[PDB]
Design a protein around this nucleic acid. Structure first.
Lengths: 204, 233, 125, 105
RNA sequence: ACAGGUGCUGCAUGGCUGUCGUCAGCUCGUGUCGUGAGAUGUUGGGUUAAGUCCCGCAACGAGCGCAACCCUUGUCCUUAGUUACCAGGGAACUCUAAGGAUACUGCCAGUGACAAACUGGAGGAAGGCGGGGACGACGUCAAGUCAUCAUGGCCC
């Protein structure tokens, strides 16, 4: 019922997380290998807190820009964990691609990290509304002009599923120049899957 | 300035109550008689209560306390504004917003918005805005000035309230009773004298009469402030 | 050499105006030879004859795009623009007929789930 | 007047056909202005969190001249669903017929 | 060990979707009223496409919706001139495709509560939401989807 907040804003106040050009024959190969890179790396860096990743590429090599809040664990001691992943990234990708790590100054303003933290707590059996309120409080104090988090499913283990949302601030979805971060992750609980959506509104 | 004279009160016509059908039976002690189906307020009583009210406002203003001038009647708005400004005292003269004092923590936001709009129009911020958008911001500022222009510098609850036409300002009286802040009020023959501490039985419908009471209160508060400034050195 | 550009639907006519006999050259061919539809024949001469000067100017018209009546409307708009370029006092009389206002009407796009711009699939009740 | 009796996710039997036709001809006896009847007999869920009680559905979309009235009934058993659907349809036929007859005066 | 399952359950679910409905609504904080469920705000006078706006008003404010920011089209300008154009090799014009200008009830005459607004007129390519699209509130229908995918349980 609701359009994707980033998808409907891609060209007005936002930017794609892929910036390569391919001929119509090359588009399929580039996009397929790109999706494979994203999936493999998101499964590999599950322990770390990694937000949006920009797999942009020139001819030949690529420059994969991963933004995270745990640079030490991502990079490793003297770059011993970034290079181990570098070799696999090149092994499955094409020409050797340079991966660079950027830092998230405010992890409570990134909708993906907040959603994944909520999901981790839910999987560790934390009370659902406790998690919702904790996330809303942290983000609304971390400078965010608005937050809205939505949980959907068998909350607590109930047979009848339900949707519970919590808003604080503005989050003006229908405005295109809103700079609304959005994320939608899932918490794998013992009674199914909980859907965790987070909207974070932070200006113009 | 602590005492009021009966002669000029009679000249102004503070003893003219309503007809002998709208009266509140709780105004019986102060009513002197009925002349041509019109109640006559006892000048002795109104002057006796007025002296106590003037003493109370002198004592209050000598302690740098704020007494809020309330009156929205068409025969009291401008005079209340003038005398409250003269005495440097907060006032409401157009409409008593419900919750002015009982919901003052929410009125704080509107007061702050008004004051920051005064700042933006004082530092010349209209050279960065548009034409009609700056005009609508200015209109919002003026609209808020009408409602809460006299109580922007209030900075808390008042230590007393001076209301004209208690019956008209029954909402302010109810809020004053709610919060316990004393209320001195001019109450007419048809009005309810309950919930009012310093009641002044007087005609509240004539502009000439209302001017007398409001000017007397302003002069008393001014004298109290002047005396309180005499102990600086 | 007063030149005007006119547009309509999809056609875009560039017309050149000179004081002359009345030779109208629509895209290299005469007006009547180029326009086989009399309705599209009137429209080209409508602005010239509106102010009573049909045989007073040589016209060099080059239409491109559009159909056969859209091109006539584009030529009329271009002639109107060239005539007002020649004289500004032409505009007060040539505006009351609506010859200078560009017609912004265009083919409304086919919308999804519809047969046409507005047409909807039927459903029997 | 048409009578269509379709079955979604269930095999409509001869007994179901009779149990819908007999009530349809009973309503069509008092109302003779019916254009069409379409009855869908469905099995809309498995009652996985309530134990049936609404497992079978019987819906009737009837069309009259100038109006279309739809009724539905959920029930554990399809025959009871059919009877409840029929009763709602009869009540709506009576309602429309009496409104139309009382519009003349 | 297991893998595999387009096997079952959409009435255990996530994600996605239809629908009322691009309808103008749906709520909350504080305050006040009521024993209470609740109410008020959100009602009323107008006005609008619109809970749009103004004015009143025990309400004062806020949020999601409305509107705007987005795309395209309609006029003009700037950079550029090939594979585009052709007025006289040309750098005019058409065109192509990036950045802008314009439009705001801005102006006039009226009606209107000294209001919001409405009616008409000028100029302009466009006039009052210029035309079209994207955008689909809280919820509803145990609506659709376990056969895109993921997924608790059951089953081979």
């Amino acid at each position: 019922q609701k359009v994707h907040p980033i998808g409907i804003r891609l060209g007005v106040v936002k930017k794609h997380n892929a910036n390569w050009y391919a001929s119509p024959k090359q588009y399929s190969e580039y996009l397929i290998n790109d999706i494979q890179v994203r999936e493999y790396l998101r499964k590999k860096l599950d322990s770390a807190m990694i937000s949006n990743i920009m797999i942009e590429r020139p001819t030949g090599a690529a420059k994969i820009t991963i933004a995270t809040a745990r640079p030490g664990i991502v990079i490793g001691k003297k770059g011993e964990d970034i290079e181990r992943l570098q070799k696999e990234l090149t092994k499955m990708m094409g020409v050797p691609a340079q991966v660079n790590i950027e830092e998230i100054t405010s992890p409570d303003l990134d909708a993906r990290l907040v959603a994944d933290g909520i999901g981790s707590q839910l999987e560790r059996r934390v009370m659902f509304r406790r998690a919702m309120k904790r996330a809303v409080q942290n983000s609304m104090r971390s400078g965010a002009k608005g937050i809205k988090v939505e949980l959907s499913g068998r909350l607590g283990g109930a047979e009848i599923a339900r949707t519970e949302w919590y808003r604080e601030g503005r989050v003006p979805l229908h405005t295109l120049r809103a700079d609304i971060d959005y994320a939608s992750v899932r918490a794998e609980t013992t009674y199914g899957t909980i859907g965790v959506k987070v909207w974070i509104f932070r200006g113009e | 300035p602590t005492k009021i004279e009966m002669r000029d009160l009679l000249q102004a016509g503070a003893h003219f109550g309503h007809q002998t059908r709208f009266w509140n039976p709780k105004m019986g002690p102060y009513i002197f008689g009925a002349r041509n189906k019109i109640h006559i307020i006892n000048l002795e009583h109104t002057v006796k209560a007025f002296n106590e009210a003037l003493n109370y406002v002198n004592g209050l203003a000598s302690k740098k306390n704020k007494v809020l001038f309330v009156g929205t009647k068409r025969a009291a708005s401008g005079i209340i504004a003038e005398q409250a400004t003269r005495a440097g005292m907060p006032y409401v003269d157009h409409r008593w917003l419900g919750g002015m004092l009982t919901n003052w923590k929410t009125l704080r936001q509107s007061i702050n918005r008004l004051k920051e709009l005064e700042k933006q129009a004082e530092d010349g911020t209209f050279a960065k805005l548009t034409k009609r958008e700056a005009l609508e911001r200015t209109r919002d500022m003026q609209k808020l000035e009408r409602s809460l222009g006299g109580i922007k510098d209030m900075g808390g609850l008042p230590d007393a309230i001076f209301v004209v036409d208690v019956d008209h300002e029954a909402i302010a009286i109810k809020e004053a009773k709610n919060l316990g802040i004393p209320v001195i009020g001019i109450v007419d023959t048809n009005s309810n004298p309950d919930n009012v501490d310093y009641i002044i039985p007087a005609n509240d419908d004539a502009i000439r009469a209302v001017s007398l009471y409001v000017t007397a209160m302003a002069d008393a508060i001014i004298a109290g402030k002047e005396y309180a400034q005499t102990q600086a050195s | 050499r007063n030149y005007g550009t006119g547009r309509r639907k999809t056609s875009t006519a560039r017309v050149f105006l000179a004081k002359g006999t009345g030779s109208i050259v629509v895209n290299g061919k005469p007006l009547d030879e180029y326009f086989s539809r009399e309705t599209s024949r009137m429209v080209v001469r409508q602005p010239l004859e509106l102010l009573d000067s049909p045989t007073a100017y040589d016209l060099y018209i080059t239409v491109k795009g559009g159909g056969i009546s859209g091109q006539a409307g584009a030529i009329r708009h271009g002639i109107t623009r060239a005539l007002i370029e020649l004289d500004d006092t032409n505009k007060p009389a040539l505006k009351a007929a609506g010859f200078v206002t560009r017609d912004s009407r265009q083919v409304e796009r086919k919308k999804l789930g519809l047969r046409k711009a507005r047409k909807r699939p039927q459903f029997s009740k | 007047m048409n009578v269509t009796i379709r079955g979604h996710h269930i095999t409509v039997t001869e007994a179901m056909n009779n149990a819908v036709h007999d009530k349809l001809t009973k309503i069509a006896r008092h109302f003779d202005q019916i254009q069409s009847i379409q009855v869908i007999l469905s099995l809309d869920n498995s009652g996985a969190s309530d134990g049936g009680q609404k497992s079978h559905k019987a819906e009737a979309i009837m069309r009259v001249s100038g109006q279309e009235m739809f009724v539905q009934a959920l029930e554990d058993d399809m025959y009871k669903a059919i009877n409840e659907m029929a009763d709602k349809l009869d009540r709506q036929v009576s309602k429309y017929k009496t409104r139309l007859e009382r519009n003349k005066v």
